[PDB]
């Protein structure tokens, strides 16, 4: 009744939903606490992160820095691969990915520079080629410069600066923190007080208004005690702005309009401590003596309730929710509460490899000087136990264990952690993300599924700026760990592989492990011996893939692994529309090519092992449906490749021309045609047969 | 008494080791693991692990050759016993296997150490345990470039599937993206293999992982580091000079999937690899690398993301200066 490709498409749809059901942050960080860690040595194949390269500060910057009379400062523009150094009233930028960079000098400023930041531009203000705005704050004024960071053939942005005539006198309040919103709004704060200012600017000059203005959103008056800021933090997904004070007070501001900023929550350390005391597990790691050293916003795409992470100097991660009083009039929250605490790990870093209650007393992260969190939870902590050498604790969610955990009430914030040592003299200054922000889905459920996006987006990389250089740290995927582990089994027994494989099964489950073997066998992770590793991966896919059984049948883990891998290769395509109507393609052509190559390499792998892989060759009811299921998947693969080739052919011509000379029903059918329908449903095939019959007609008119 | 009582052979081994007759102890520990005595497999793993240590250091009177002659024998068996243990552990927990057979296996495996032939055929290969199949090839010095590579391909695919099914289900915690679990299954072999050239041939495996990273779309689309295949092999201990030697071979042949505008990603890999190479030399290569980076630039113009390419060309031309 139902043909092969339609049967396999059913498996894809159900697999997509399974990946998009990955637990949301609120679900495994429920009210309570956790100390769950599995620590890995930094030199281990199971390390969750590792250093890939380093970039020294240019010698000319050292000449200027040691030529500093009063004040110097370093910072990162990780989004574009640039770093900067300010010396008194002079500023120097450079591309740290370049082996011998030239210094972009800017010395117009008259007074000491106190802060520098790179923010998005205000729309409809600048020429489209201006990609960013450079904000330079001195003790006398704030200066805006246009920036164009266009990519180069080498892979590092070319940076050119533009004057703007946009500037405003600073005033009496120091500026040490500058943050920008998605829409180009610029907010300022510093070490004089807790006030937050905003810089406005517009293209047109008016007789009653200047091109650039500044206002204090805090409207202070009367008696005020000493208190200033330690940082500013933006969350565009909620239109919120957070400030952290030197007294560890957390203030939340809501952008109720394009020019408004309203304080809506103020939560001092006493309030946090009161919440903490009402929790089941209180700890001497968090007292009235403890300082909060950093905040990290959590976007609404990642979690609904948990808005914010706060890091103590003892290494405790405080996760705070925020809630509005009502459900309708963005809606501003009015309350903030400490709900969940992740306590520090216990293992300390060691030169030599050392050998179930809540651990709420570890000092391993004491003192924590700097801290950063990146979605879906990558955590960097600069531990400064000694005044000369920083130690870097880096952890990630145990995505594999979180995904397999059952039932939902057993979910905990499992983590994989490691210690990265920096050499003597390296003082960490800043850590920034160099790759695109992580997101496996568009809502909390499914958002944190690292496994699903292993082959759709490069692993996250992070630039660690120190006083001596920039270190690149890269997140390692399951396939990276699996390939590395197998690389150590090349010179060992049949039982050596089985032992290493069992480690993966106990953490990730059998399907995820066999899917990793399939991926490695197909060359994934090789963008980083390699024939033997891929042959070992093939051996693991065959030997440990399981078999089909009567419970309606239960297909082998080898089959589910093939379906899982294939689904993840096309997850960005399946439910997407093929075209966007001047008609264009929803998916960039370059992305369609890589997807097709991946599908074809998978097909090539199955053909070259049709004789050795169980189920491919024809074979009692169990092995029968195993053969039918595997056959249907392979028919979907070739259909996927044909479908992609058809779309590429289509846009090589002039589709808008073809679309014009077309009937309405076929324009409408093409309007809402998905890749799933093209791959697995007759109407996509019938429509494809119409389009080919139409493109050739047009091709004859061009007559090439 | 050691001949018929395991716990008395224990003292004789302790007797020798307090007197510092280390070889004589490993001589008994090894000869005891190979015995016909009722000893669990996990104990025989301890015996061979102690024997490997006691036979690693010089002992007064005994040769260097007879010392290594025993260390090599013990090390071999330990590698096999570890496979056999990790195999049994997985077979017993395998839902695909009947509970009647699992008991028949456990009696056979949970004791003396069997031949790799027995471990491979009647168990490892049938269950499609591709990772443990590779460990057997390594432990058996199995010379065959194809089957080693075919097994790697199956291991990668089966791993990708298990991870994509998990991500689709989310499953207690957020599972990892596919390439992450695939990366784990290679690291597990890499440390365990000790990076033998036969079962870990970068000449072929790295293209496979890089191919998998394309054919299965493990890239920026899902938030992954596009250069995660390079980052994997470098951090695993592969020489920089070799990785760039392979990417060179990939960029010229242009065998699929490394064709068309997807070669934009090949250059990104080359930039990452070479960049990590000069940064590793300046922290502490010839004309052919400069020949490549310049040739890699033709690719970016031949492909001319309009700003990504432009920014990438200026990262390549930066490395060409750093080498010349």
């Amino acid at each position: 009744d139902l043909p092969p490709v339609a049967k396999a498409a059913q498996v894809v749809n159900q697999t997509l939903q399974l990946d998009d059901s990955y637990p949301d942050l609120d679900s495994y960080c429920r009210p309570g606490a956790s100390s769950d860690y599995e620590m890995q040595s930094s030199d281990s194949s199971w390390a969750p992160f590792h250093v890939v390269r380093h970039h020294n500060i240019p010698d000319k910057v050292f000449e200027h820095l040691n030529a500093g009379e009063v004040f110097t400062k370093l910072g990162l523009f990780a989004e574009i691969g640039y770093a900067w150094a300010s010396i008194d009233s002079s500023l120097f930028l450079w591309d740290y990915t370049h082996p011998n960079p030239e210094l972009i000098g800017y010395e117009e400023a008259t007074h000491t520079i106190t802060a520098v930041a790179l923010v998005p531009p205000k729309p409809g203000v600048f020429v489209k080629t201006i990609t960013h705005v450079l904000v330079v704050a001195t003790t006398s004024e704030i200066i805006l410069l246009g920036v164009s960071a266009t990519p180069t053939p080498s892979g590092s942005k070319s940076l050119t600066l533009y004057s703007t005539r946009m500037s405003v006198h600073r005033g009496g309040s120091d500026v040490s923190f500058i943050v920008g919103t998605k829409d180009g709004r610029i907010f300022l704060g510093g070490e004089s007080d807790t006030d937050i200012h905003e810089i406005f600017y517009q293209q047109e000059e008016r007789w009653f208004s200047s091109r650039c203005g500044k206002i204090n959103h805090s409207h202070p008056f009367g008696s005020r005690q000493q208190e200033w800021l330690r940082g500013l933090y933006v969350d565009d997904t909620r239109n919120l702005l957070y400030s952290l004070s030197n007294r560890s007070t957390i203030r939340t501001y809501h952008m109720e309009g394009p020019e408004k900023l309203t304080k809506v929550i103020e939560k001092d350390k006493t309030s946090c401590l009161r919440d903490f005391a009402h929790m089941a597990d209180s700890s001497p790691l968090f007292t009235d003596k403890t300082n909060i050293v950093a905040l990290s916003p959590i976007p609404a795409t990642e979690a609904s309730k948990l808005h914010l992470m706060a890091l103590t100097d003892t290494g405790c991660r405080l996760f705070l929710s925020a809630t509005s009083s009502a459900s309708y009039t963005a809606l501003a929250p009015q309350s903030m509460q400490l709900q969940f605490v992740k306590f520090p790990p216990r293992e300390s870093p060691t030169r030599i490899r050392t050998l179930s209650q809540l651990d709420k007393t570890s000092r391993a992260l004491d003192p924590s000087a700097l801290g950063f969190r990146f979605s879906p939870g990558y955590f960097f902590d600069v531990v400064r136990k000694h005044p000369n050498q920083d130690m870097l604790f880096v952890s990630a969610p145990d995505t594999g264990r979180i995904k397999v955990t059952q039932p939902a009430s057993a979910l905990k914030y499992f983590e994989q952690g490691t210690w990265i040592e920096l050499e003597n003299g390296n003082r960490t200054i800043e850590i920034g993300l160099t790759t695109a922000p992580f997101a496996a889905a568009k809502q909390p459920l499914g958002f944190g599924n690292e496994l699903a996006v292993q082959f759709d987006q490069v692993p996250g990389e992070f630039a660690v700026l120190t006083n001596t250089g920039v270190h690149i740290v890269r997140r390692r995927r399951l396939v990276d760990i699996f390939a590395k582990a197998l690389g150590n089994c090349v010179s060992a027994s049949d039982d050596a592989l089985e032992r290493e494989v069992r480690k993966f099964i106990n953490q990730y489950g059998r399907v995820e492990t066999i899917a990793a073997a399939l991926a490695v066998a197909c060359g994934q992770g090789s963008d980083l011996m390699d024939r033997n590793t891929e042959n070992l991966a093939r051996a693991a896919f065959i030997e440990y893939g399981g078999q089909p059984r009567l419970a309606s049948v239960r297909l082998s883990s080898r089959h589910d692994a093939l379906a899982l891998y294939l689904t993840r290769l096309v997850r960005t395509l399946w439910k997407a529309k093929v075209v966007q109507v001047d008609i264009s393609s929803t998916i960039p052509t370059s992305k369609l090519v890589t997807i097709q190559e991946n599908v074809e390499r998978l097909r090539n792998f199955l053909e070259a092992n049709k004789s050795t892989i169980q189920g491919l060759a024809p074979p009692d009811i169990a092995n029968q449906k195993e053969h039918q299921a595997l056959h249907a998947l392979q028919k979907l693969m070739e259909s996927i490749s044909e479908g992609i080739s058809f779309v590429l052919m289509l846009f090589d011509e002039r589709v808008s021309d073809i679309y014009a000379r077309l009937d309405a029903v076929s324009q409408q059918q093409l309007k809402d045609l998905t890749y799933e329908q093209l791959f697995s449903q007759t109407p996509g095939k019938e429509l494809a047969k119409v389009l080919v019959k139409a493109i050739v007609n047009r091709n004859i008119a061009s007559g090439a | 008494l050691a001949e018929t009582d395991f716990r008395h052979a224990e003292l004789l081994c302790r007797f020798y080791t307090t007197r510092s007759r280390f070889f004589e102890a490993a001589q008994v520990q090894t000869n005891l693991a190979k015995s016909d005595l009722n000893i669990s497999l996990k104990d025989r793993i301890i015996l061979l692990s102690r024997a490997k240590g006691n036979a690693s250091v010089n002992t007064i009177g005994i040769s260097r050759q007879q010392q290594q002659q025993l260390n090599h024998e013990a090390s071999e068996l330990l590698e096999i016993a570890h496979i056999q243990d990790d195999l049994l552990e997985r077979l017993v927990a395998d839902p695909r296997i009947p509970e009647e057979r699992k008991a028949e296996i456990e009696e056979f495996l949970d004791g003396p150490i069997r031949t790799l032939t027995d471990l491979f055929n009647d168990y490892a290969d049938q269950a499609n345990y591709y990772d443990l199949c590779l460990l057997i090839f390594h432990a058996a010095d199995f010379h065959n470039p194809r089957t080693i590579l075919d097994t790697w391909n199956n291991l990668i695919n089966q791993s990708h599937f298990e991870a994509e099914q998990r991500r689709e289900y989310w499953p207690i915690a957020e599972p990892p993206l596919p390439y992450v679990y695939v990366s784990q299954q290679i690291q597990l072999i890499a440390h365990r293999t000790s990076l033998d050239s036969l079962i870990f041939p970068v000449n072929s495996l790295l293209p496979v992982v890089c191919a998998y990273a394309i054919n299965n779309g493990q890239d920026a689309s899902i938030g992954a580091d596009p250069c995660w295949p390079i980052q994997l092999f470098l951090n695993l201990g592969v020489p920089h000079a070799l990785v760039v030697q392979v990417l060179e071979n990939v960029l010229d042949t242009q065998e699929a999937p490394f064709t068309g505008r997807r070669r934009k990603l090949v250059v990104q890999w080359i930039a990452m690899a070479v960049d990590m190479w000069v940064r590793e030399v300046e922290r502490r290569m010839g004309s052919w690398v400069s020949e490549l980076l310049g040739r890699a630039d033709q690719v970016l113009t031949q492909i001319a993301d309009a700003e990504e390419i432009a920014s990438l060309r200026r990262t390549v031309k930066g490395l060409k200066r750093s080498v010349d």
Binding site: - | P98, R101, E104, F120, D122, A127, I136
Partner: peptide
Amino acid sequence: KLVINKDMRTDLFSPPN
């Protein structure tokens, strides 16, 4: 010493006798 022999094995997925 390894010798692959896919020919005659024992069905890992069937009980004995």
